[PDB]
Design a protein around this ligand. Sequence first.
Ligand code: SF4
Lengths: 352, 430
Amino acid sequence: DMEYYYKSLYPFKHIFNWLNHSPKPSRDMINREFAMAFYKRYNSFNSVQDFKAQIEKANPDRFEIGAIYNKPPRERDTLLKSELKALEKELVFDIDMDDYDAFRTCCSGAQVCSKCWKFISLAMKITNTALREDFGYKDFIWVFSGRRGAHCWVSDKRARALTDVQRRNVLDYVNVIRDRNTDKRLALKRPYHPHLARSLEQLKPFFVSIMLEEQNPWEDDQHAIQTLLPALYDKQLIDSLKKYWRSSKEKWNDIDQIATSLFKGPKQDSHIIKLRECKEDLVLMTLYPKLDVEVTKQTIHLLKAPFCIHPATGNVCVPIDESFAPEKAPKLFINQFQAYVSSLLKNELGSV
Amino acid sequence: SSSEEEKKLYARLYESKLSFYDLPPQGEITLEQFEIWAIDRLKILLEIESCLSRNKSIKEIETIIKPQFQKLLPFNTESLEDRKKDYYSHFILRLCFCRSKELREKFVRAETFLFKIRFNMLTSTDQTKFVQSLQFISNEEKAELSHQLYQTVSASLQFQLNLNEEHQRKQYFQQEKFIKLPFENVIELVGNRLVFLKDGYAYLQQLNLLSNEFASKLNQELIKTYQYLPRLNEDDRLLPILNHLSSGYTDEINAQSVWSEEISSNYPLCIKNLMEGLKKNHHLRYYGRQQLSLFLKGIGLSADEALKFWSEAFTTMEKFNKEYRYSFRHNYGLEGNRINYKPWDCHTILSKPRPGRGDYHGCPFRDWSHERLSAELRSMKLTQAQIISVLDSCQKGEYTIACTKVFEMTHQTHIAHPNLYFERSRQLQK
Ligand code: SF4
């Protein structure tokens, strides 16, 4: 199956053109590191024919894209370990369904569907908004991870030349939800940063529709106690709500009703402001993108190449559009990749 | 070059009260002024380094160094001589500290911190003038992004400028100008999110960017000066001075807590005597004053808190500022040769002259009568056998042994320092 996939179906020419950033072969592909999972690292290819032939001969389950080096990775055995220095690589983001499992009830374990894909889609929307309006990036594409995740590949030349410090700073700017535990209040800094306020504003309309109706994770009283209650700030309010405890909507309104009943006097304004802040924090915890921090920090990190086959499900890691769903991924898009690669090439020529 | 040309070039060089030190100075100065100015700037820089190594706050640092500005290298003066002092001192230290990478790092760190201070006492109008002298955004572009910029900088204004009221923050934001720069040069602010970031550009927290640029330019100029130094190795006059200057480099306790029982319970007998005499007489004599001040310095009382405590214990401010403020600051080593005086140990205390009437310093185990000491022990609930033991220790001249005994009964055994007594007593509660 993998032999036939790499022989006839895998788009080698298009991946080569995307990675080389030039129609003619250059050092962007000759010096680019390739790792093959069967774990053999430091492979490189001089042409589309060499790429296709080596992939067909080795027959790996998947292979991963590395950074651009000063010298070919295939000749590393003839070079000192300090001689191979990383120059450029596309800025990459990794998002998975694992960190949202405490907030979904349609699927259990490693299963995914279009209902729980809304978390991933909102993550893409927020990340794209950040990269476009804030970082000004234009040539970025989102690729299905194969089972339940999405990979972002920012091919902007400025993004490609970023150092590890710049990549870490970018990730810290984007990765607002640093602590993924659901048993503790986020207590995000106030006032909100414009990026954070904008992200909350975009995530607010979908919050009710997903969480309180479609997922309904807090309908279970124990689940509510474990996740929804710790998002609050007042111990008396938490105890009163626990004693009183309904679908997620009823509990959400009970929070406001009990807070109004408990907090009275001149100090009620501070309490309602704090409750609203906690509710926004919980909305962000439920809906904000939860990136994989490791893959983005360093230029030398290796990420799974596009159009790879997932070993467990057979889904091909296709690029993701606005209407993509996990079910739409075919089992063992090219034109969309053609459009993206062509736009990247014209932008590269414009930058030149 | 003539005097008029020199004055014009200088007025062009210091159109702002601060300078980036770009063009080397032009003129002739004597070896006297060379050495003196280099020593002055090195003294200020060594003081900044000593403050850094103690992790002092920024505010405390400018409080210590403002008089050193008024004394050694006065700033914010229209005198050309002082400005030339600053310029030539900076370039002389540039010459001196460029030999090794460690020296370059230390020099650029201290100089950038000095730049931070100097920009701090400069006024907002003067800060704007210096910054104008890195592209500032137009008024329309600020108005378009006013909401987002205000949201970004509100917390920074509140926490740095102490503008707690929202109206003051809004008024400051209205007059505040911004600079359009890319995030690659402002990554350190981007990570902390102190700058609004749009379309790959960061809208400036300007002091951090200015200081980073100062550090980079200063390091580059230091490297270039190290390259050019072998040509200047031919002169006999400067080389010994450069070598000499290079080798020259090489609160829980507050004014009210020391009065409380919690802290006073850890005092030794002598410090209790000093404290009580202070309370009764609202004044202490020289040896007692120095003893108590040095003990308080040893236990961690700050210079400002020491000044407040000493002023409030002496229940006019004119005579205080005239006669005791300098002594109480000099005990901390802030003037003169700046001696961070070590607190007196029991040998130093016992080497002082014996106290008389009205004198409270010394050691109670030596200067008090056995009756008064015994009564003070009964006040500490000490039994008669213990009292006899400490009196036997005192009668032999082993006052430190008696104090150690008192510590053990009231609470590496031997204690020969009141500060050691206090530290061990605090440890027993920790
Ligand atoms: S032995 Fe030392 S610490 Fe104890 S009372 Fe005498 S001088 Fe003070």
